[PDB]
Ligand binder design. Sequence first.
Ligand SMILES: N[C@@H](Cc1c[nH]c2ccccc12)C(=O)O
Ligand SMILES: N[C@@H](Cc1c[nH]c2ccccc12)C(=O)O
Ligand SMILES: N[C@@H](Cc1c[nH]c2ccccc12)C(=O)O
Ligand SMILES: N[C@@H](Cc1c[nH]c2ccccc12)C(=O)O
Lengths: 387, 387
Amino acid sequence: EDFVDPWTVQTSSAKGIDYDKLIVRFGSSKIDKELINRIERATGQRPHHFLRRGIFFSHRDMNQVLDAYENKKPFYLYTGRGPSSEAMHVGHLIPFIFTKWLQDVFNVPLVIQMTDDEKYLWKDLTLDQAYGDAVENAKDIIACGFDINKTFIFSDLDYMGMSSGFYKNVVKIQKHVTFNQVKGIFGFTDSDCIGKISFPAIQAAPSFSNSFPQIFRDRTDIQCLIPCAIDQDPYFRMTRDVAPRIGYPKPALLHSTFFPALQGAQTKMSASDPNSSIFLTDTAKQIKTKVNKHAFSGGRDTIEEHRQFGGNCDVDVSFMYLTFFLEDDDKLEQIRKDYTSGAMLTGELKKALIEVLQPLIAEHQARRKEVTDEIVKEFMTPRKLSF
Amino acid sequence: EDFVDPWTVQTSSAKGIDYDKLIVRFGSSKIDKELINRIERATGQRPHHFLRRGIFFSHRDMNQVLDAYENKKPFYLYTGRGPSSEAMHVGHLIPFIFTKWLQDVFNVPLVIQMTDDEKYLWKDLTLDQAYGDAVENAKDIIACGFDINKTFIFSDLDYMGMSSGFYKNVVKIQKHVTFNQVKGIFGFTDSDCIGKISFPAIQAAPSFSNSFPQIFRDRTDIQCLIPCAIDQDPYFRMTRDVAPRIGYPKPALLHSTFFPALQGAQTKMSASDPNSSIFLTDTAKQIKTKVNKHAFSGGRDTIEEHRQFGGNCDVDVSFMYLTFFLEDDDKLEQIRKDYTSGAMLTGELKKALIEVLQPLIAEHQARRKEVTDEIVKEFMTPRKLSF
RNA sequence: GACCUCGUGGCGCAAUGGUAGCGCGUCUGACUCCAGAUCAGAAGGUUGCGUGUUCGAAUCACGUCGGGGUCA
RNA sequence: GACCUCGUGGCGCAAUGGUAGCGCGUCUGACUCCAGAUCAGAAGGUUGCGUGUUCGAAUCACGUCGGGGUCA
Ligand SMILES: N[C@@H](Cc1c[nH]c2ccccc12)C(=O)O
Ligand SMILES: N[C@@H](Cc1c[nH]c2ccccc12)C(=O)O
Ligand SMILES: N[C@@H](Cc1c[nH]c2ccccc12)C(=O)O
Ligand SMILES: N[C@@H](Cc1c[nH]c2ccccc12)C(=O)O
């Protein structure tokens, strides 16, 4: 019995979360082959590997989004981030990497939310500190290549006070969610502060277009698509239930699996936990070390046993990371084959990984460094977005 | 055992609420003669009759406000209103009448809050309807003579989205109040909506100057004074407890007694209840009728018994209303004397009342009619206030 | 997503198959200098909505809207 | 406003008057192609803050800050 909620991914199996069980448990829908070819037919583009490889595996109302898109009816993307301190590891990238692709292939506007107020309520920092962390994380997000002409990155602490329609939708949503409702959904108790208790309303507000008057004037019927880590589904199950009751459309969803922590898929990568993560501000040596010194293996103890029994892929953190970052499907297969056959040793694998991580993480740093203050401020300026 | 909270004033005694017991029960301070002369010494003005006659009877930190004022340290007024539909009776005026005086004699800026979002959560209407009711009630408030150069009337639904510091203080406050805290203070249950559960934070935010950046830039140490009906003390007991913990000063308070309902001081006047109120949009005949047909009497049944036993003032709604609106202290005394002695009959009294109500309510209508849309919009424009 | 529950004159209750009643309130006249109190009388709902079963339903069933609760 | 309660190495616990210990975690070497597992060793806190009582306090008292609870 795996446990998954907005603040905890914990399972006993080394193979990690049983996503098939998660889909059922949550009521979401499995993304099947049909849906994928259906996505390709609509974009005229080859499905991103996260879709091919089941990284993004679950959805909600996707066919309706496609049915609309295909019929010239526009949708907009909405995803977000809880601002961090120094953190921001590769795991935090998956959703954003996919969102950038979705933005390209479908050519649609996007709103990214920086829940600095959330952190302020959950962690121990000042609004300035929280807001700061956000404007900062903005760089890394921007560094993913989001089109500045179709992307609006905002901080709750800020935008809330400069929008004639966001707080208005928070009030609507709040009126339609009870303390009992969220007590169940998230697990809040009478002891939690009123601020945490009503925060869900805020993570839901972006699902409704008229929350962004300067981007959609006051249109209240524009489809919304939320790419995100399955652990965020709770907010939007709630959002989908509130939607009709206040006369707005339900946000569609594309769910992604968690990026396994270095010590094993028993949990997801996280800045809070020791050596479990590879940060976006990591030197090629640090990247190299962490992989050689912390990545859990599915390979046999000795070169001896490994040759006669090969390694196990269902648990090899290194092989898992490759499933996420090695583009070429042929190379990933060769490795899976050889590693399984014993033909390849764990270290030869750990090396293949580091060869793909270092350059990726390096490029990120390279693009991050090109993010000027003028730019950040632009992305973060309520303004009309293209399309 | 009288019962008083933000939504209910109920007592069994015809003499109404035992305010002395209320002060103790709430922990507030009785406004004694000293404090009154102290107010006169500071303003160089004769204390308003609400103070002379105990209408405004309780306070919190008033001496500190005076100590500061007298030493050239400025404070600002903050009071508010839950927007109504057609309502707005004389009872709703007391606080505002006194606030206008305080504004004059002390010469200080003022923020008036229109909790349209509160109504939206508690009643059954649309945000437009709620916002509308507010912009409307604004007229009647303005009609009280508040200096447009020192007064800012705002609606939560609106201002919240155009302030770089209000929502910021709501977030601070929310983090420092638990669901249990407000469950106790107000009586909210797990069934109430998250919006009602965290609303108190909003009625508290105006107590802090930096909530109004366009009026006080980002000063966080400006004394605040809240004139209000004692039934609102719960929000500010809570506000005073949260204040220091977030590094802001505690709001001072001036409490006023309730305006007794026509049928008797057992409850306060209210639009919800039948014939218990006299509306600001009432014809001289309606005013006249309500008083002759509904005002509870303390006079004897027949002219006979009344002459030998006189009337009772501790329960006569009409005499109570006069205590509120008859300026001249000598006339009020003559009436109290004669009515008690039997020298005057109840109807002669009911007549004296109507003679003071009709002209007052008439003037209000007269000034309300002069409130142009340009003006309302002005009062409601975040802008620098004089002093 | 599924499940439970409620939905009736302004308010609070009743009539679990064959004509929707009561209390509070609201209005009248009597009585009082008024008001209250006390007497006497009256007005007000096709039962959230749409069907269906039935000779006939508020009550039975399906659907739907809305409030509250609950589940992996 | 008053009252109760807690506050200790990153985490989670202990020592209710006379020298702050343990577990988890973190680092080393052994072992493994790595990692994990298993062995062997080590580093890390003057106990929210300020006093006071005492020969001596984390533990007692006063004050104060912060978390949680409670009252008319
Ligand atoms: N609460 C999320 C941040 C977030 C806000 N809105 C979102 C929409 C999609 C995904 C994530 C988000 C986090 O901690 O990462
Ligand atoms: N373009 C990369 C995404 C990416 C950006 N920055 C990164 C840093 C590390 C790994 C991947 C990335 C991809 O398709 O996967
Ligand atoms: N909630 C109060 C309105 C209000 C808001 N802020 C205030 C400050 C003082 C007095 C009243 C208020 C009411 O219903 O009337
Ligand atoms: N100026 C009046 C206040 C007031 C304004 N409008 C009113 C309407 C009815 C009664 C009083 C008023 C006073 O001093 O009491």
